[PDB]
């Protein structure tokens, strides 16, 4: 009828949902489907023009309340459904972007071409908001820290990517590749998150 | 014979960090499993924040003094204990944020509702209020300039409830959750009302499911699966704990 | 504005607690030494450089958007950008903006 | 989002382990922290009481929080004491009680599975009983309780449910299924009762 | 039934058979006659989200006919052998549409049947979910049963099986 574009869009959205649902592959968002967005926007614009057309033709012409009410109501419901499909797709993209931002605030700030300009600006400001929340009052705790319980304090690790020498809180770590440390898990969480130390 | 426990109690009747930590974990257990956003314990979080600040300062002072016997075991104990506390509070706060954004529009309309019996400040911390406002405004900006811009005003509302399907999300009050009947928080049973002594001598509460109009008896020391709405009032009274 | 030299070992705890803990910034030995030298040059007794380090990290996160700021060019770049933002607000510099920095031929 | 999807409404087994880690248990200190009448740093914690830790005496049983005991057990500087339910006799009695009553669960402590796993992993040599037999009996109890749970599942009504004496780990592992099936059954009934 | 439920959104856009009650003018935009109106007593398939509103406002404009999925044949099939029913073939979102139809019509018997079907299939899907393959160094029944599930059953199964796998992994680590 008229919701076919929104139906395809929400089908693709659920497809992306299962895509990211599997494991924790941390894949980037699929490219913004500006094509379907523009198509459904053109459909909505044409239906809005049809509503204005029906209104003015009822004003000038002699149309009973029956047809004028019914066609206008049906078209309004059509915009309701199409807007709901667009809202669901955009909400999915926003929530997955939130996931990427929350998990990767201490990991990396990254292919942005898959996102629209509004989404890119949203991510850019949302990182700022997250940092503001971390530094506002709950600064003593790390809000972006690991959500797994700290079962053990001292662990051994192996250097994946050689980073030369990095100053830790008190001493210093010589991240020689293929070398194993046995140190506190507390001060190496960020390095493991980035992908430098591997063992547990 | 005559029992003398009365006089033994007579002669025996002449804020602790452990209690604060236990209350914090009880709140975290409730927050993880409850469908709705439970009220923020402002005083408890303030006390824990002060404790963490002073504890971290003390740990740093000990480390500086040691940086000039070699019983480092207590220092490691403070380190891992502070780590556990920080992890607990981190998980609690992030769960609360997930609940805030799940019900962002519900919170906003409750704020706008003058007949609402609560206020967001009475339910959220200052940081939570800041995050709710910022996220609401930015997501509204994105939906406006992305979708709502090309839309007529009658369907441009971001909190439309009169459409074909309600577009404001509400907490599922009838959600099914695990509960354990702790009974009254104090050790005395007869002091607390609603504890109708069931058969077999077991003290129990009695609550009604209005949908089925069915009376169910919850015995103390028993684990149940219940609709959250029925338990909600008792849960606010700490008589039961979410499992 | 008192010039002084502060050694990396003493600033290392605070520098870590700020850059790495607060926002997730990796610090190298050379970058730590250079930043200590800069802090000592632009402040004496090395106490109220916390705002300076916070400005450094926030500008680095807003513009650079990577890690391992201790590379002598991320540090220098953020320092200079702080210099021009202080200049346009009208420390290390309080002069006026020049079009020569904004005029170029390609 | 701030909370990952798999942590939305259930606890990961690591979270259950962490929660159980705060239970107090009785241990034998291999050191003696009792500062004599004739320096040292006290634990002076805030999640628990330091009084016992500052006053430990070698080979004198005290009670401390579980995770501190495990941290000490990382070295040979302590020793874990198994609770009274971790004896072969009590396990056998619970087995007989379970086999005797097919409709009700045993009165085990709520954290028995996780405690058994932790003690077997990190305190494998602090049991008067053969560990190879304790593991088998624990597995047998787990299987019997699973069998009972499956039979109790055939009576999933739409109003409520009573899982009496059930342990913590089983509840945590069964939460996402039961709490979701129960929701759908309630929703169907409510939709039917829309008059 | 939340607004942003993807499953609910997909379930809303499902065609249902329904006759007309008025000779309404000017409709049929994509119903084989854009300018030509829609006649009275005309049986057409309409999306459920729109047919829901069209079935209440009016004598209502549209009279909904019982869909094939809730015909007495499918009811008898459900009452016969709930476990061996390929409900996915009937529809990918059968339970949500059943819920919506019952809510609209207050048809208690359909709700009673679907609740029993849900319970009986929940038993089997829990049996499958808690069954974890162990490598001695994907059973046939597991896969041949998984294809007969709607997305919600496939979602409950995924969540429960993930919980079981996490429990097993932690227990034997």
Swiss-Prot record, chain A:
Keywords: Cell cycle, DNA replication, Nucleus. The keyword Cell cycle applies. InterPro entries: GINS_A, GINS_bundle-like_dom_sf, GINS_Psf1, PSF1_C. One of its GO terms (biological process) is DNA-templated DNA replication. It comes from the Eukaryota. Changing residue 84 to G: In PSF1-1; temperature-sensitive mutant. Defective in DNA replication. Impaired chromatin binding of CDC45. It is found in: Nucleus. The keyword Nucleus applies. GO terms for cellular component: CMG complex; DNA replication preinitiation complex; GINS complex; nuclear replication fork; nucleus. Belongs to the GINS1/PSF1 family. Component of the GINS complex which is a heterotetramer of SLD5, PSF1, PSF2 and PSF3. Interacts with PSF2. Present with 1431 molecules/cell in log phase SD medium. Required for DNA replication. Functions as part of the GINS complex which plays an essential role in the initiation of DNA replication by binding to DNA replication origins and facilitating the assembly of the DNA replication machinery. Required for the chromatin binding of CDC45. This is DNA replication complex GINS protein PSF1. It comes from Saccharomyces cerevisiae (strain ATCC 204508 / S288c) (Baker's yeast). The gene is PSF1.
Curated annotation (Swiss-Prot), chain C:
DNA polymerase epsilon is a heterotetramer consisting of POL2, DPB2, DPB3 and DPB4. This is DNA polymerase epsilon subunit B. Phosphorylated in a cell cycle dependent manner during late G1 phase. Phosphorylation may facilitate the interaction with POL2 or the activity of DNA polymerase II. Phosphorylation is independent of DNA replication but dependent upon CDC28 in vivo. It comes from the Eukaryota. The chain holds residues 7 to 173 of 689 of the full protein. It is found in: Cytoplasm; Nucleus. Present with 3110 +/- 251 molecules/cell in log phase SD medium. As accessory component of the DNA polymerase epsilon complex participates in chromosomal DNA replication. It is required during synthesis of the leading and lagging DNA strands at the replication fork and binds at/or near replication origins and moves along DNA with the replication fork. It has 3'-5' proofreading exonuclease activity that correct errors arising during DNA replication. It is also involved in DNA synthesis during DNA repair. The lineage of its organism: Eukaryota, Fungi, Dikarya, Ascomycota, Saccharomycotina.
UniProtKB/Swiss-Prot annotation, chain D:
InterPro entries: GINS_A, GINS_bundle-like_dom_sf, GINS_Psf2, PSF2_N. One of its GO terms (cellular component) is nuclear replication fork. The keyword tRNA processing does not apply. One of its GO terms (biological process) is DNA-templated DNA replication. SUPFAM superfamilies: GINS helical bundle-like, PriA/YqbF domain. The keyword Signal does not apply. It is found in: Nucleus. Keywords: DNA replication, Nucleus. Pfam families: PSF2_N (PF25005), Sld5 (PF05916). Its main location: nucleus. It comes from the Eukaryota. Component of the GINS complex which is a heterotetramer of SLD5, PSF1, PSF2 and PSF3. Interacts with PSF1 and SLD5. Belongs to the GINS2/PSF2 family. Functions as part of the GINS complex which plays an essential role in the initiation of DNA replication by binding to DNA replication origins and facilitating the assembly of the DNA replication machinery. This is DNA replication complex GINS protein PSF2.
From Swiss-Prot, chain E:
One of its GO terms (biological process) is double-strand break repair via break-induced replication. Keywords: DNA replication, Nucleus. Its main location: nucleus. CDD domains: GINS_A_psf3, GINS_B_Psf3. It holds the Pfam family Sld5. One of its GO terms (cellular component) is DNA replication preinitiation complex. InterPro entries: GINS_A, GINS_bundle-like_dom_sf, GINS_Psf3, GINS_Psf3_sf, PSF3_N. Functions as part of the GINS complex which plays an essential role in the initiation of DNA replication by binding to DNA replication origins and facilitating the assembly of the DNA replication machinery. Present with 2205 molecules/cell in log phase SD medium. This is DNA replication complex GINS protein PSF3. It comes from Saccharomyces cerevisiae (strain ATCC 204508 / S288c) (Baker's yeast). The gene is PSF3.
């Amino acid at each position: 009828m008229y919701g076919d574009l929104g139906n395809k869009l929400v089908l693709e959205a659920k497809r992306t949902k299962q895509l990211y649902a599997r494991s924790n592959q941390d894949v980037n968002l699929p490219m913004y489907h500006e094509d379907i967005i523009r198509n459904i926007l053109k459909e909505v614009s044409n239906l809005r023009k049809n509503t204005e057309y029906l209104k003015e033709q009822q004003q000038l012409g002699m149309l009973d309340d029956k047809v004028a009410k019914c066609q206008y109501f049906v078209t309004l419901l059509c915009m309701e459904r199409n807007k709901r499909c667009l809202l669901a797709y955009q909400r999915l993209r926003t929530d997955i972007l939130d996931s990427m931002a929350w998990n990767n605030n201490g990991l990396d700030l990254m292919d942005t071409n898959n996102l629209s300009h509004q989404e890119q600006e949203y991510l850019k400001e949302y990182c700022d908001l997250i940092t503001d929340l971390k530094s506002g009052d709950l600064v003593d705790i790390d809000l972006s820290g690991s959500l797994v319980p700290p079962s053990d304090v001292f662990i051994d690790v192996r250097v994946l990517k050689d980073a030369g020498e990095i100053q830790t809180e008190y001493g210093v770590f010589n991240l020689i590749k293929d070398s194993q440390f046995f140190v506190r898990q507390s001060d190496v969480e960020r390095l493991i998150q980035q992908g430098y130390l591997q063992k547990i | 014979d005559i029992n003398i426990d009365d006089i033994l109690a007579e002669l025996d009747k002449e804020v602790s960090p452990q209690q604060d930590f236990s209350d914090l974990m009880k709140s975290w257990k409730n927050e993880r499993c409850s469908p709705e956003l439970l009220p923020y314990p402002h005083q408890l979080m303030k006390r824990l924040l002060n404790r963490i600040s002073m504890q971290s300062q003390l740990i740093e002072n000990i480390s500086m003094g040691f940086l000039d016997n070699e019983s480092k075991l207590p220092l490691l104990c403070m380190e891992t204990e502070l780590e556990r506390l920080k992890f607990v509070i981190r998980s609690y706060i992030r769960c609360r944020l997930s609940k805030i954004d799940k019900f962002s529009l519900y919170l906003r309309q409750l704020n706008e509702d003058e007949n609402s019996l609560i206020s967001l400040t009475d339910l959220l911390s200052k940081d939570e209020i800041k995050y709710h406002d910022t996220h609401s405004l930015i997501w509204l900006k994105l939906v406006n300039d992305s979708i709502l811009k090309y839309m007529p005003e009658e369907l441009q509302a971001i909190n439309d409830t009169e459409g074909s399907v309600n577009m404001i999300d509400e907490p599922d009050w009838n959600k099914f959750v695990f509960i354990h009947v702790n009974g009254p928080p104090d050790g005395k049973w007869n002091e607390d009302p609603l504890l109708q002594e069931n058969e077999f001598g077991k003290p129990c509460y009695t609550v009604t499911i209005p949908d089925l109009k069915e009376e169910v008896e919850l015995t103390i020391g028993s684990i149940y699966v219940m609709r959250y709405e029925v338990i909600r009032d008792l849960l606010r009274d700490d008589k039961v704990a979410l499992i | 504005v008192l010039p002084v030299k502060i050694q990396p070992p003493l600033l290392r705890p605070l520098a870590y607690r700020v850059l790495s803990r607060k926002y997730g910034l990796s610090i190298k030995s050379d970058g730590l030494s250079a930043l200590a030298e800069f802090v000592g040059t632009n402040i004496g007794a090395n106490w109220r450089q916390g705002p300076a380090t916070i400005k450094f990290l926030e500008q680095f996160a807003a513009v650079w958007k990577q890690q391992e700021r201790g590379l002598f060019i991320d540090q220098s770049g953020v320092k200079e950008v702080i210099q021009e933002m202080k200049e346009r607000e009208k420390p290390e510099s309080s002069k006026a903006l020049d079009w020569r920095d904004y005029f170029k031929v390609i | 989002m701030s909370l990952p999807a798999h942590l939305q409404q259930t606890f990961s087994p690591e979270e259950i382990q962490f929660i159980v880690e705060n239970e107090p248990i009785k241990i034998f200190p291999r050191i003696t922290t009792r500062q004599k009448i004739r320096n040292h740093t006290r634990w002076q914690l805030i999640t628990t009481d330091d009084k016992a830790l500052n006053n430990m005496v070698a080979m004198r049983s005290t009670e401390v929080v579980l995770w501190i005991a495990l941290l000490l057990k990382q070295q040979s500087k302590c020793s874990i004491v198994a609770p009274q339910w971790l004896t072969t006799k009590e396990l056998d009695r619970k087995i007989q009680y379970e086999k005797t009553h097919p409709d009700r669960f045993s009165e085990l402590p709520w954290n028995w599975l996780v405690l058994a796993r932790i003690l077997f992993n990190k305190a494998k040599d602090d049991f008067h009983d053969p560990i190879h037999e304790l593991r088998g009996k624990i597995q047998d109890l787990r299987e019997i309780r699973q069998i009972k749970v499956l039979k109790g599942l055939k009576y999933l009504n739409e109003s409520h449910l009573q899982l009496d004496n059930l342990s913590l780990l089983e509840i945590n592992e069964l939460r996402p299924f039961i709490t979701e099936i129960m929701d759908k059954l309630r929703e169907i009934h409510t939709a039917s009762l829309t008059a | 039934m939340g607004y942003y439920d993807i499953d609910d959104v997909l379930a809303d856009g499902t065609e249902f058979p329904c006759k007309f009650q008025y000779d309404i003018p000017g409709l049929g935009y994509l119903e084989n006659n854009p300018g030509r109106p829609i006649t009275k007593n005309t049986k057409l398939s309409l999306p459920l989200w729109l047919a829901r509103i069209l079935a209440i406002v009016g004598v209502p404009f549209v009279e909904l006919l019982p869909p094939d999925m809730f015909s007495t044949k499918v009811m008898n099939a459900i009452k016969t052998d709930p476990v061996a029913l390929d409900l996915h073939s009937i529809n990918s979102h059968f339970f949500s549409l059943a819920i919506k139809w019952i809510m609209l019509f207050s048809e208690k018997e359909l709700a009673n049947v679907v609740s029993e079907l849900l319970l009986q299939r929940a038993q089997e899907l829990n049996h499958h979910a808690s069954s974890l393959s162990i490598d001695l160094n994907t059973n046939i029944a597991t896969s041949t049963f998984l294809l007969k599930l709607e997305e919600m059953e496939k979602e409950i199964y995924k969540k429960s099986h993930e919980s079981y796998k996490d429990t097993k992994r932690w227990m034997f680590k």
